[PDB]
Amino acid sequence: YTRVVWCAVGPEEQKKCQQWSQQSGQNVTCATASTTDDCIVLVLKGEADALNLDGGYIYTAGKCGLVPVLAENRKSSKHSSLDCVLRPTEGYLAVAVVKKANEGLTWNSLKDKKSCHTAVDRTAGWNIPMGLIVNQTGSCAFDEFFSQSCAPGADPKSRLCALCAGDDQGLDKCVPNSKEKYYGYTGAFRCLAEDVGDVAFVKNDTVWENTNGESTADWAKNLKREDFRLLCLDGTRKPVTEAQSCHLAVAPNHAVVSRSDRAAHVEQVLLHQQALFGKNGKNCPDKFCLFKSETKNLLFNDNTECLAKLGGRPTYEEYLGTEYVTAIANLKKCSTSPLLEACAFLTR
Ligand SMILES: *[C@@H]1O[C@H](CO)[C@@H](O)[C@H](O)[C@H]1NC(C)=O
Numbered sequence: 167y168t169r170v171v172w173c174a175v176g177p178e179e180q181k182k183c184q185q186w187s188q189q190s191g192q193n194v195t196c197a198t199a200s201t202t203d204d205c206i207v208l209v210l211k212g213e214a215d216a217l218n219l220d221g222g223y224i225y226t227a228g229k230c231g232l233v234p235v236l237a238e239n240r241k242s243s244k245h246s247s248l249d250c251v252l253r254p255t256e257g258y259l260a261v262a263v264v265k266k267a268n269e270g271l272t273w274n275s276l277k278d279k280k281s282c283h284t285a286v287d288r289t290a291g292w293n294i295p296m297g298l299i300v301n302q303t304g305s306c307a308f309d310e311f312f313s314q315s316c317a318p319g320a321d322p323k324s325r326l327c328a329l330c331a332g333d334d335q336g337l338d339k340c341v342p343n344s345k346e347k348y349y350g351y352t353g354a355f356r357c358l359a360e361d362v363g364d365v366a367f368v369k370n371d372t373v374w375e376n377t378n379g380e381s382t383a384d385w386a387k388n389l390k391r392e393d394f395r396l397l398c399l400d401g402t403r404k405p406v407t408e409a410q411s412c413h414l415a416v417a418p419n420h421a422v423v424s425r426s427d428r429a430a431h432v433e434q435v436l437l438h439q440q441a442l443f444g445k446n447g448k449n450c451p452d453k454f455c456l457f458k459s460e461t462k463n464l465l466f467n468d469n470t471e472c473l474a475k476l477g478g479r480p481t482y483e484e485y486l487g488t489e490y491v492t493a494i495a496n497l498k499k500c501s502t503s504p505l506l507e508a509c510a511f512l513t514r
């Protein structure tokens with residue numbers, strides 16, 4: 167009970183957790199498992215107390231009877247808000263943007279249209295819109311929904327890659343990294359800017375960044391924000407400035423999760439742990455850093471500024487929100503989780 171057992175996924179996280187444990191003087195200790203699903207099970211089973219999960223996993227742990235403890239507060243990825251512990255920063259906005267000059271285009275007029283995605287299986291670029299598209303329709307065949315798309319990471323033979331176009335030489339088509347020209351936020355946005363796609367699924371921050379002189383890239387630079395609208399779920403459209411009222415869903419901050427019975431205590435422990443090892447912590451560079459990893463995002467995301475208070479005791483569905491929940495629930499209906507299945511079994 168006094169200790170808090172963390173669940174690491176992989177040897178790289180395991181190693182980092184071991185150094186944490188050591189430095190914490192054994193108040194934090196570590197269970198390791200091969201998959202995230204396996205950790206949620208350990209926690210469900212009381213053999214581990216906590217770990218930190220992404221949105222899809224919060225949903226799934228949520229359904230199995232786990233709850234969010236502290237939210238991972240971003241910085242912006244560099245830059246500013248404060249103070250970090252008391253207020254959770256909202257979490258970025260997934261938007262669907264289309265050219266203003268195209269007005270015969272709405273959230274309900276997207277079938278057989280052309281789509282530009284950031285990547286397959288990303289939150290803003292894939293998971294939220296396709297999750298919601300299939301809410302709209304009731305089919306799991308979102309793959310057949312757009313006539314053509316650029317969805318980096320999908321099958322290159324398929325319609326979902328038909329719009330990607332690799333790099334200068336056309337090489338590495340539909341690859342899920344920067345080498346694919348319409349990869350990521352910028353690329354998805356360029357895909358719409360050059361009218362290769364009808365709709366681009368990005369975040370609010372994306373059009374601001376590539377319009378009106380934020381970017382100098384030859385494709386971006388003479389771009390105008392005027393020229394782009396946002397597709398809201400009420401079927402209307404609005405300017406890019408109004409993302410807060412015209413988005414698909416919020417992309418959830420990663421969060422620590424726990425048995426409700428243990429939430430108070432793991433919380434209490436981590437607040438002190440980050441005072442020791444967090445961004446201003448007594449001991450960070452000096453002995454150990456909670457939000458730095460020798461590889462990438464081990465245990466927490468590297469751009470995490472602190473763990474922050476919920477205020478308080480939200481369920482998963484109140485943490486994620488109705489749109490995000492509808493989104494993921496739709497995805498998981500279409501491609502099941504063994505764990506979600508397991509959690510619905512009447513033998514647990
Ligand atoms: C949208 O993004 C821009 C750039 O990050 C920011 O200035 C603005 O506050 C954001 N708007 C909303 C509604 O979050």
Ligand SMILES: *[C@@H]1O[C@H](CO)[C@@H](O)[C@H](O)[C@H]1NC(C)=O
Binds near residue numbers: 493
């Ligand atoms: C889901 O579908 C209903 C009708 O099917 C719609 O009115 C509602 O806005 C949709 N919800 C989301 C979160 O997209």
